[PDB]
């Protein structure tokens, strides 16, 4: 196969490029593709072993997106993009809201809102699966468990768009329009937090605003930038795990008819759902020193890029990886993460939750889904993401 560019945005026009990852996986799993160039690492086991290695595998050294001063300067002050010891100190900080008895108790509430979601969705008849479902639920979920009123959650989902869709022509009008949106989301969270320090009230604000280890509490960029991480996050990961488990379900027909039949099969189904769409294709870490990844000799200084799409088609750890089954059991997919990584998802307990709450209830009100037209993808190197797909009930 050509030596396709994995960092150019171009090559998912199509979808992901599952053949080039199974070439790759086969022939040279470490792979150095030269321009600067990068490592493609497309094998569950290295994934795995450069994430639980953050001393030779960096974050903050070069960042963690995979394309090639202002940049990395403008963004080391996000989580994702720092090392232990700084980033042991604020992942403690900030994760006191995501535990998962702290999770479990939003069960009711999300249930409440997904059963409106889909009962407005069936009375308008066609809609936007995007719109109207996938993007909906975590938009209102986040909204409340942040702590903004649900009258403002538009202004939340318009300002995440902003932030990741840079290489989407619907998403973004030049190169400044994801700062302009963090301005903005700073003078928000800003406010917010000025109130709930007066006034404390049962949210995530709150709960960061009061949060104390080690004698540290969050600063104020250090509290901005978490609040935009965690509002990017909610809004575009999510939705895209919903929209295309939706379009699994209705292109593998005998699994949406056993999630129907048989409820009790959503939470596996999550995970198939998880492992199949890998709505996060990749991150990048830097080498800090010279070092040996799966026999290959990785200099000081190089790119390192891990494909979780391409861990989640591994033939050594999934039986016949390109079939999509619900009860697939286990499951150690690597959507959220190569687990044993500091940085594994934060939020991975909230997401399984949403997606499992709204397939229990679009399978519970048996409506006869079906596609109206093509999904449309969003333009991406980064987020394996559907900007809309019509549909009717
Ligand atoms: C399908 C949904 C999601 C997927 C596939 C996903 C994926 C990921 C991945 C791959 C990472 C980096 C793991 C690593 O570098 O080792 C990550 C980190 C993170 N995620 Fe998730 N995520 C999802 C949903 C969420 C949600 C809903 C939230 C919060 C509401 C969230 C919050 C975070 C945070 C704060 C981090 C940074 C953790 C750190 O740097 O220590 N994610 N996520
Ligand atoms: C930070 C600021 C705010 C200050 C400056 O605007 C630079 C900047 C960029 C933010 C970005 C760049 C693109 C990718 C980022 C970092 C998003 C990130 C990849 C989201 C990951 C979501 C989830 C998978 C964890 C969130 C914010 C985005
Ligand atoms: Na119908």
Redesign the pocket.
Request: glycine share 12%; net charge neutral.
């Given at each position: 196969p050509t030596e396709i560019d994995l960092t150019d945005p171009d090559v998912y026009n199509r979808g992901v490029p599952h053949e080039q990852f199974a070439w790759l996986r086969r022939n040279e799993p470490v792979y150095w593709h030269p321009e600067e160039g990068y490592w493609a690492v497309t094998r569950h086991a290295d994934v795995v072993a450069v994430?639980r290695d953050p001393e030779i595998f960096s974050?903050q050294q070069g960042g963690?997106m995979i394309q090639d001063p202002e940049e990395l300067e403008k963004q080391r002050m996000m989580?994702?993009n720092?090392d232990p010891p700084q980033?042991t100190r604020l992942?403690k900080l900030?994760s006191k809201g995501?535990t998962p008895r702290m999770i479990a108790k939003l069960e009711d509430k999300i249930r409440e809102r997904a059963k409106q979601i889909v009962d407005e969705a069936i009375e308008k008849g066609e809609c936007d699966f995007v719109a109207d479902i996938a993007a909906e639920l975590?938009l209102q979920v986040?909204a409340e468990?942040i702590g903004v009123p649900q009258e403002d959650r538009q202004r939340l989902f318009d300002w995440s768009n902003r932030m990741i869709g840079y290489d989407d022509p619907e998403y973004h009008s030049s190169e400044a329009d994801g700062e302009q949106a963090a301005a903005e989301m700073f003078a928000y969270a800003q406010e917010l937090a000025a109130e709930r320090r007066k006034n404390p009230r049962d949210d995530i604000v709150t709960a960061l605003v009061q949060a104390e280890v080690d004698g540290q509490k969050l600063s104020d960029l250090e509290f901005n930038m978490?609040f935009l991480?965690?509002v990017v996050?909610?809004n575009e990961?999510?939705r895209?795990?919903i929209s295309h488990g939706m379009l699994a379900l209705l292109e593998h027909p005998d699994q949406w008819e056993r999630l129907r039949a048989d409820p009790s099969l959503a939470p596996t189904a999550v995970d198939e759902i998880?492992r199949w769409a890998?709505?996060?294709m990749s991150?990048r870490r830097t080498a800090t020193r010279d070092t040996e990844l799966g026999g290959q000799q990785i200099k000081a200084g190089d790119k390192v890029v891990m494909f979780?799409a391409s861990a989640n088609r591994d033939e050594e750890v999934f039986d016949d990886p390109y079939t999509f089954d619900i009860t697939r059991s286990p499951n150690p997919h690597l959507?959220?993460?190569?687990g044993g990584?500091?940085?594994?998802?934060?939020?991975?307990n909230?997401?399984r939750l949403?997606?499992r709450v709204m397939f229990e209830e679009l399978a519970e009100i048996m409506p006869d889904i079906e596609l109206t037209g093509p999904p449309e993808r969003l333009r991406s190197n980064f987020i394996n993401g559907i900007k809309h797909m019509p549909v009717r009930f």
């Open positions: 994430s974050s963690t989580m994702l720092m980033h992942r900030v995501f975590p986040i468990l978490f991480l965690l996050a909610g990961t999510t895209n795990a998880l890998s709505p996060v991150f979780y959507a959220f993460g190569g990584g500091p940085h594994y998802c934060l939020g991975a909230l997401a949403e997606i």
